[PDB]
C-alpha cells in the first residue's frame, strides 16, 4: 500500500485527515505526544480497528523525533503545529517553536528518502494581514503574504500566530528547496465540520459561538473579519480532500489557499439564526460595531480550482451541515 | 413620494403587497382587469381612502396595456400572471400567455424610464421539479431549474404551470439584460395568511384543505410533496416584506427563493389537528403514507437571508396565525 504520515493524530484537522486517508486506501502512520491518554486518542483506536493505522509518540519540538514515523512513507502531512494564538510571549511560545518544529519535521521527511511530497498545513493568517489594501473590491491569492512588520509593530490579538505562519512557511519552503524535496503548503481559512477527535476545541468554539452565545468566540469571528476583510469558511471534508488532492496531483506545487466561501459575521449570524431557531442567535448589530454587510476583501481559491479541485460544500448550509452535532458531542453546545 | 406599481390588485398576493406598500409610505398604482366589479375590487377602494392608491384598468395579455400604470413608478412589482394550473391546453392557456404577458409588462417598465427595478413574482414550481435527485439529503437553491423536458414528456398535473414559470423567467431575464433594467425574481413556495382581497381562492383552498376536508385540495398538498420532496410554506407577510426588501436593496440581484419552513403533509396535519380540534383533521394514513415522515428535499432560503432578509413567521403556529379566519371570511371554511 501507499503510506501516509499525519502529525498530531489527536488534533481536529489531523483526526479528520487520518480518517479520510484510511477510507481512500492508504496505510497511515500518525504521531501523538501522549498515546497513553485515551481520553484524547480513543478515535485512533477506533480507526485502528478499521484500517491500517499506526500510532507513534513524538514531539515535533525535539529534533529527529519524527524520523521513525515518516520512515517508509510516500506522503507526509504536517498538520501538528503550535496553536498558542494568545501566548503571553509569542516569540518564544508560538513563533520560534513553529519554525523550529516545521524544520525538524521536513528534515525527517528528507532523511526518510521515500517521501514523495510534504504537505504542510499552514493558515490563511499567513496571507490576509494586508493593511496596505484599503477600500473594497480586493481579492487575495497565493502571492499575498501577511505583513510581519505591521504585526510586530502593532501586535493585534493573535499577531504571534499570524507571524509564525509566515515565517514557518518561508523557512519550510527554503529548507525543502535546499534539500530537493517537494513541498506543498495549504493555507486553509476557518474550517468547519465534524471530525473523529473526541476532545478538541480549537476553532470549533469560535465557529459555533453564535449558537453557544460565547462572547469570546464571537470576538474571534469579529476579529477575523476586521483584520482580513471577510469571514472565510471551508468545510473540514473539503480541506481534507484538498490535502489529498495536492499530495497526489504531481502537477501541484507551491502554496494553495483552501477556502470555499467568503461571507461576513452578519451574513453568517442571519443564516444561522434562520437554520437553527432553537438557539437564540443574535442578529441585530447596531452601529459602532465596525461590521461589514459584505466582504471587503475575499480569499481566492482559483489556483486550487484551476488545478482541478472541486469543493463539495459550497453554501453556508453545506458548510454547517454536521458541526452542530459535533459541538454537542464535544460539550461546546449544551443541547 | 416613491411610487410603486403592482399588477393585479384584486389578486391574493397582489392585494397584500399593495396594503404593505401603502403602510410603508409608498404611493401605489395598481392594475385590475375589471375595476367595475366591486365585489372583487372593494378592498382597493378601502385602501384608496386610507392612502395614495391609484387603480387602473389593464390586461397583461395586450401589448402596452401597462404603459400608463407603470409610468412615473420607481419600482414595478409584477405579481399578476396566468394561474390556469390545470388548463386543458396549457401551451395556449398558460405557457404562452405567461411569457407574453411578462414580456409586455417588462417592456412597459423599460418604456417608463423611471423604473429603477422590476420585482418579478414567479414560483417555487420553477425550481423544484428535479426528478434527477433520488433519496433524501438534497437542498435546492436558486441554481435549480424545473426540468422542462421531464415535464413535457410526462405531463404531470400542473406541468404547464411549472413550465410557464421556467420559460417566463428566462425570457424576462434575457429581455431585461438587453435593455439594462434591473430585474429581480422571487420564487415563493406555498404562501399562507390573510390578505385584503375579498373574493380570492387560489392556494388558500389547498392550504386549508385539511380543515375543510376538501379532497381536491388535499390532493394538491400531497402532490407538492410527492413532486418536490417537501411541503414548503411561507407567510404572506414575509413574502411581501421580502419583495419590498429586494426592491430596496441595491446589492440584491437575480433570482431569490422565498421559503420559511420545509415540512411535510403529515407534520402539517398533526399540527392542524392539535391546533384546531373543532375541525375533523385526518392524521392517520398508511400506504398513501407514501407521504414523507420528514422532508426529502428542502428549499434553501440562504441567498435571501444572506442578502439581509429575516423571516418573522418561522413556526407552523406563526405561519398559520391568521389564515383560518381569512378562510372563513372567504367562504372556504364554514365556521
Ligand atoms: N481549526 C481551524 O479552523 C483552522 C483553520 C485554518 C488553519 N488551521 C491550522 O491547521 C493546524 C491544525 O489545526 P487544529 O484546529 O486541528 O488544532 P488542534 O485541534 O488544537 O490540534 C493541534 C495538533 O497539533 C499538536 N501539536 C502542537 N504542538 C505540538 C508539538 N510541539 N509536537 C507534537 N504535536 C504538537 C497537537 O498535539 P497536543 O495535543 O499534544 O498539543 C495537536 O495534535 C493548525 O496549525 C491550525 O492553526 C486551523
Ligand atoms: N398563492 C400561493 O400560495 C403562491 C405560491 C407561490 C407562487 N404563487 C404565484 O404568485 C402569483 C400570484 O398568485 P395569487 O395567489 O395571488 O393568484 P390569484 O389570487 O388567483 O390572483 C391572480 C392575479 O393575476 C391577474 N391576472 C391573471 N391574468 C391576467 C392578465 N392576463 N392580465 C391582467 N391580470 C391578470 C388576475 O386578475 P383576474 O382576476 O382578472 O384574472 C389576479 O389579479 C401567481 O403567479 C402564483 O402562481 C402563489
Ligand atoms: O489554530 C487555529 C486556526 C485559526 C484560524 C482562524 C481563521 C482563519 O481564517 C485561519 C486560521 O483559528 C483558531 C481559533 C481558535 O480559537 C483556536 C485555534 O487553534 C485556531
Ligand atoms: O398559483 C398557485 C401557486 C401554486 C404553488 C403551490 C406551491 C408552491 O410551492 C408554489 C406554487 O399553488 C396554487 C394552488 C391553487 O389551488 C391555485 C393556484 O393559483 C396556485
Residue numbers in the entry:
A (entry chain B), B (entry chain A): 11 to 345
Structure paper excerpt:
Dihydroflavonol 4-reductase (DFR) and flavanone 4-reductase (FNR) reduce dihydroflavonols and flavanones, respectively, using NAD(P)H to produce flavan-(3)-4-(di)ols in flavonoid biosynthesis. In addition to their sequences, the 3D structures of recombinant DFR, FNR and ANR from sorghum and switchgrass showed a high level of similarity. The catalytic mechanism, substrate-specificity and key residues of three reductases were deduced from crystal structures, site-directed mutagenesis, molecular docking, kinetics, and thermodynamic ana-lyses.
The position and orientation of bound naringenin in the ternary complex structure of SbFNR2 did not favor its catalytic reaction. The C4 atom of the naringenin carbonyl group was 5 Å away from C4 of NADP+ and its oxygen was not hydrogen bonded to any of the catalytic triad residues, which is consistent with the lack of activity observed with this substrate in SbFNR2. The para-hydroxyl group on the B-ring of naringenin was hydrogen-bonded to the phenolic side chain of Tyr-138 and the backbone amide of Leu-200. C7 of the A-ring was also hydrogen bonded with the side chain of Asp-216 and the backbone amide of Thr-212. SbFNR2 and SbANR did not display any activity against naringenin and eriodictyol despite substantially longer reaction times. In addition, both SbFNR1 and SbFNR2 displayed ANR activity, reducing cyanidin and pelargonidin to epicatechin and epiafzelchin, respectively. It is especially noteworthy that the activity of SbFNR2 against epiafzelchin reaches 43% of SbANR activity.
